[PDB]
Design a protein around this ligand. Structure first.
Ligand SMILES: [Ca+2]
Ligand SMILES: [Ca+2]
Lengths: 122, 372, 122, 122, 122
């Protein structure tokens, strides 16, 4: 699963296509990396389940992160750009409506909404 | 030069005789001929392909005898004649494809590196800072820079930290230059194991002095792995200056403030420090805390072995015939070479504690114009 | 290895095939997972050595484990099902005889035996 | 890798060619030898660095020597004739200019100048 | 020099021939190695010059050595068989005389005389 490389098209559909390489794997976690002359691309996948409690609900959290960092130039130091998403639900929940909610969240976010969001427009 | 070599060993031999009229009419001989032949290349320092074909036997000889009128026949301690052919081969297995590309892709050691601090740009300028500060303080006493909470002790602390950083970078450079030797960095991967078993029936084991039939079973095993060596590209290495001046500088620093007040300070090795700090600064800024590398050739080794074991079937043999169990083994090995498209990788040089030594050196709180 | 997917055919060779997916691998330890609307299927494989004793023969161990969980419904709480095998034999002894043992056992067990065995018979 | 033999032409390009043979090789050092009725010829080549002075740029030094031993005859004891050259420059210097210096020295030395030198004329 | 390969013919002329080759050289000493199932062969060649003293003639010594070792089998432990000859003569003496003395030594020793020396009679 997850192949030996993770494809990413920065800029949405129709953008420049990069291909990160599988570089590490442990305990349901895996990570992809690729070096570039002025920057680098980082992508990791993690899973986790919380411990059992006497009288509570057992939940599971997924996480996916993309990270992008550019090397220093002149006096300007290095800086990194990243964005990650998580999903949380009970152990035995129905998968399909969870997928529906995920589709909702993905569809809501678009380039226009990102532009509005970065402008601190609450 | 490529040579083909053949070699053999004797596995077993025995005797079988037939009597008639009280005479040994036929007393023919039987031989088991352990065989192997190899190919290899010598005289070239570079790694070469090689392969081996190899086979052995293991036989429990027959026994017994039968009697007739004025004649008999006997095969005591006589290995079966079936071994005279000894033709055996490995079982078919799934074919591998593109092993070299996958090995080259998975094996790449490039990975992110520690971020370069801001003062690395000013790294080349440290020596004159210290020299001018010490000279001005000596000329006008210690009262200088009391407005900045500065003095002799902070200066000595900062220069000691700089020597520590210089030695650490020196040792790391020494290690890199050692690594360039002995073929570079080697890595290994595993490419799976294939196992298969089958059954065979009705194998005739002997065709004289009666007849013998035995069952047959086969086992097949295959391994596959690959190795490559990653070596730094020539000219990308860091400076490799040796260093005994730092020992002398540390010896001077041990004299204390009183010693430096005396003529001791004029003994500092300013020129060496300037040269090496400039070299290391220009190198670090040229690269990004990384050394380049390129891959050598990619090799794959695929050993294959099989076992051929038999059990005697007694329902199609003369009653006097006893035993005859035997087994055989066939082994092959191979070494082959491949190469792929050009690739370059980056490996971190120094991390964390290496670069954090002098990130907060105290002299930075004095304005530059007084020094400059 | 043996692969990334394992097939579980409930009811023996009758049918009802299930295909788990590889999730992890840590030091000769592998486990596969598969979620379902009302159940979860998980399998595990392990190999190990005993503690070394100064003058006793060393032993091989193989473990193959099947488990199943049924999600709480109505007032019925969580509960699990599983069935696992263990094989033990010395280091370096003949593999084929050890194979014949164990597979003799596997041939012995069948539906009628489980029907009797579950009835606390002995 | 100069070769298994070295040629010494006494008296310049005139003649009297002697052929030396390789004897010892160790530590970037070589030496050749040849016996005769009344004398022996020998050569040596060496390479090394200096002892670093803590305010000093590293150098490398190159030298080669010829030796001539004459066995004792009559009442006159044995003695030796030798003549050697050395070259010194920093580590990592340009080889072109360092080599260029040295051919000038070779060109300067000749019959007449050797005659002057043997006369204690400075 | 002496050639890369050294040939030893056990049994003298018309006998069994074995071949040796260079493995290392140092300090005017060179030696070779050959592997064999039940034994092995060693060949060594050395040169030396005695230390200089105020008043007496200085000497120089040449030595060559053959030895074979038979690997221990069963009860019989390891053991060796070796033979070596040395030539000592002054630094300046004529070579032809020393060569003649060595040739005399070589011609004197033959098979029957080897047997007689094994006979212990002086
Ligand atoms: Ca002349
Ligand atoms: Ca020139």
């Amino acid at each position: 699963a997850l192949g030996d490389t993770l494809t990413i098209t920065l800029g949405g559909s129709g953008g420049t296509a990069k291909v990160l390489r599988k570089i590490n794997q442990d305990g349901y976690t895996s990570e992809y990396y690729l070096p570039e002359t002025s920057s680098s691309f980082r992508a990791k996948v993690r899973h986790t389940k919380e411990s059992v409690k006497p009288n509570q609900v057992q939940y599971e959290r997924h996480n996916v992160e993309f990270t992008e960092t550019v090397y220093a130039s002149g006096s300007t130091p290095e800086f990194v750009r990243q964005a990650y998403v998580v999903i949380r639900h009970k152990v035995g929940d129905v998968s399909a409506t969870v997928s529906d909610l995920g589709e909702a969240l993905s569809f809501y976010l678009n380039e226009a909404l990102y532009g509005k969001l970065i402008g601190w427009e609450s | 030069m490529a040579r083909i070599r053949n070699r053999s060993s004797i596995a077993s031999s025995g005797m079988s005789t037939f009597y008639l009229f009280g005479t040994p009419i036929v007393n023919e001989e039987i031989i088991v001929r352990n065989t192997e032949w190899c190919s290899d290349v010598i005289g070239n320092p570079g790694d070469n392909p090689l392969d081996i074909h190899k086979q052995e036997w293991t036989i429990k000889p027959l026994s017994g005898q039968i009697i007739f009128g004025s004649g008999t026949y006997r095969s005591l301690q006589c290995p079966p004649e079936y071994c005279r052919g000894a033709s055996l081969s490995h079982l078919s297995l799934p074919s591998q494809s593109g092993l070299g590309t996958t090995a080259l892709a998975r094996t790449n050691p490039s990975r992110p590196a520690f971020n370069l601090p801001a003062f690395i740009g000013e790294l080349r300028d440290l020596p004159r800072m210290f020299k001018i500060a010490g000279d001005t303080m000596l000329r006008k006493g210690a009262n200088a820079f009391l407005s900045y909470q500065f003095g002799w002790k902070p200066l000595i602390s900062d220069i000691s930290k700089a020597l520590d950083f210089s030695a650490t970078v020196r040792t790391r450079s020494d290690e890199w230059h050692r690594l360039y030797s002995n073929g570079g960095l080697k890595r290994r991967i595993n490419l799976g194991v294939d196992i298969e078993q089958k059954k065979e029936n009705d194998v005739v084991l002997h065709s004289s002095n009666g007849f013998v039939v035995a069952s047959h079973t086969v086992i097949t095993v295959r391994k596959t792995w690959a190795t490559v060596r990653w070596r730094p590209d020539a000219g990308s290495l860091p400076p490799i200056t040796k260093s005994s001046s730092e020992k002398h500088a540390r010896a001077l620093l041990g004299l204390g403030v009183g010693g430096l007040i005396e003529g001791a300070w004029q003994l500092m090795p300013w020129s060496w420090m300037v040269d090496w700090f400039g070299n290391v600064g220009t190198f670090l800024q040229a690269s990004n805390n990384t050394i380049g590398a390129s891959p050598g050739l990619v090799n794959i080794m695929t050993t294959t072995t099989t076992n051929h074991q038999f059990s005697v079937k007694r329902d199609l043999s003369d009653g006097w015939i006893k035993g005859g169990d035997c087994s055989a083994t066939v082994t092959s090995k191979a070494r082959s070479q491949s190469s792929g498209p050009t690739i370059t990788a980056s490996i971190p040089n120094l991390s964390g504690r290496q670069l954090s030594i002098l990130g907060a050196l105290g002299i930075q709180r004095v304005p530059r114009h007084l020094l400059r």
